[PDB]
């Protein structure tokens, strides 16, 4: 039940282990039945800001005149 | 971190190739080996440079600060983060101009009664809060700033193994500068001398922020003092541009000197 | 041969018949910023031939009593033609250099000059106040500065000089001068060569920086073996310094910068 | 007279003859300049120590 | 940095009249302009810290 | 997600385990997502000192005359 | 549409919501010298973004009594940033331009400005001595000059003005102004547009010339229909001139030129 993800290496050691292998991976295993007990995975996604930045009914191009 | 080459046997010579002669004016070092100037035997080399790698050279926890708090404003202290408060780690780092690494901080906490026969207190818990440049600095050992909703804090219980945390490469440049030949401001023509003046060799006024330390327990009239010794170890190290090491005593955060300007002893030219 | 060369950059050519090879600092030749290392997003200016050419700074004179000289880059070139113009009109600037030091004598003269190129060449000040050297003193321009034989603390509290006090054997920074050989260098030993040539790539912890606030390289010239001639206690030979910026690219154009002076 | 009122958001112009003097001046310190520090952008920047990127001003 | 620091200073923003505001008769000679600020798609922040924009006394 | 490397045995015990098998290997597993939390692998490489020892433009042979 | 545009050159952008198209003089867009038309053999400098950007010269004011204005190129831009620097540091220089004249009013104003770009715009002098106008007067820089309603002969023999006397209806050169429409132009008629935009290629009988000795283009602005408003005998509307050099390339680098003034 182990989950193996890879790390985003910031500072690199003068090793090939700093660039590949299990040496740039980390392992995770959940010990509790309730999902609330789990830690945060932090592999979180993003989205389009459009719902806030452009909640416009009739879609407009920046090059084209906004007021038409 | 590897092997050294074997010594190959070398016999006598009588040739027009003269590796012994050179010209150091070029700026190069003559890459001679014993067999170039003497007769050698074959030696199978087993020694390695495993311990002199840049990583192994720095792979030690060095003391960078001793923060003190008196639990009877001294109920809390603030330490501006730096590696220049001590000399040993600083001198090693300064063998290079730039560096890039992660840091491991270990905190050794000690405390004691000032009085041999007076006072008593229950076990102390310490809070080590990191205040990134910009965050509000505590004015009292118990004001709102200690809520740490965003600042990283470490709560240490006296007597437990030394606390330890890791910090990533946090520089705003692509590498840490051990030396900065410049200013943070350029004085412009026309402005008052008070204007555009800044320290030589200084970048940001607040580079990495500081640590605020306090004892969380309610203070008792008992006289107590605690000291937090901060140890830092660079891990995952890369360094650039070697420099000669510091020969005379340090005189501040800069390359300034003043006192021990005559480091070498006397020795006869023809005395072994 | 190792001894004869010709350097051509823009409209300027340098010839030498007594070289001792040339040094390319850290084995890196100057280059422009790659897209993968780029930071400022605006289109850079690259003057090319107008800025990347040989500029001759003022000639200094070597005597038996000289302690040494120093210059800072790009500082020493701030008033040099179109290179200086671009430097002051832009917030950011980057450049490499070809430093050519010239010094000829005769077969009856002796002396050796150590020419070092130092990245982040921070020098020591003259007061008990740390990092007190003021901008105007730290940036002398083409005339550069000089090394001293001893440290002398400025005590005038009313009017502090706020200047450098670079002691020669301490390499002007608290390190022993004999170890300065770990920096790219050449030696002008009068019995061997006329000059020293060093190609310096851009060195910094950033891809581009402010040329007015920050000096990337420092050039230090120290008499390793003092000047001596026949029997003339009196001997003077000039040392001319010719430097050419390379791969200049500037970002952040606005109104011109006019720094405070003296 | 205008700070902390709805007038702090209004910059007035007029039909006067051409002048070369600035209508307004600002420093690009999005998290610290008093005029930028309290905008939604400035508010978020004050929960972080570093910022990088391009900005756009619409009038 | 998110603090006023010369080392990481950003520059100046200013506005000027190119020609002049012109209005005919029976029209207001003074009017307002409103300014807006937002980040572009290449904007990012790092190192979470506490804000000075909220406090608590006692 | 375990990384298994071999040790460089210095002092050898009078065992065959001191010369072979998993007995001369060591195991590693990363527990943290951030690479900063990782220990140093210490399997670090070396390089050519030439950039410092011989930063010369026109390469020269030691047997051959430096000044030519 | 024919009316909305955006021009971007270097770090400068111009927007307009009331244009009347744009004119490209003689149908030629500015370009660099081709190898088949090259003359000076040295490597040219091409500042690119540092010089090829929009520079705003001083704003003039249009009144019921105005007769007209004129400027000379590259003269009007000689003090403009890095363009001026390159102009003075080089013996030879070549450039094209994007001239953008700005003039807004209201729906109750009238007036029409004729904006003409003239190659070799030679103007008439003020004395009986032929070709007597002196260099300093012929090259006013960014402030340019003005047209007059009549010719007035300078009679001060002791101190001749040695200036131009451009009469408006004679186009400042002895030709009728109504025929000036044979030159690339646009008209800023207040009821129709805000501006006039002209793209000028390099025009000369040579591929490259001296920018200090020779002005290639002349910009003439004449009130074709005078300014008038509601009932205000008093009316003033500014006319701003923004010009951007294009495809700049210079040859023959040396020490900087410092021309005599006033
Ligand atoms: C070139 O050599 C260098 C460069 C940077 C350095 O310091 C950078 C630095 C930045 C932030 C922190 C904050 O670290 C901490 C945190 Cl998040 C929480 C709790 C405690 C600490 Cl302690 C600590 C150090 C040092 Cl000490 C040497």
Swiss-Prot record, chain E:
Compartment(s) of residence: Virion; Host cytoplasm
Query: Per its UniProt entry, which superkingdom is the organism in?
Result: Viruses
**Tell me, how does this one assemble?**
Interacts with capsid protein VP0 and capsid protein VP1 to form heterotrimeric protomers. Five protomers subsequently associate to form pentamers which serve as building blocks for the capsid. Interacts with capsid protein VP4 in the mature capsid. Interacts with protein 2C; this interaction may be important for virion morphogenesis.
Sum up the protein's function in the record's words.
Forms an icosahedral capsid of pseudo T=3 symmetry with capsid proteins VP2 and VP3. The capsid is 300 Angstroms in diameter, composed of 60 copies of each capsid protein and enclosing the viral positive strand RNA genome.
The identity of this protein, by name, is: Capsid protein VP3
User: Lineage from the top down?
Assistant: Viruses, Riboviria, Orthornavirae, Pisuviricota, Pisoniviricetes
In terms of the parent sequence, the fragment covers 518 to 575 of 2207
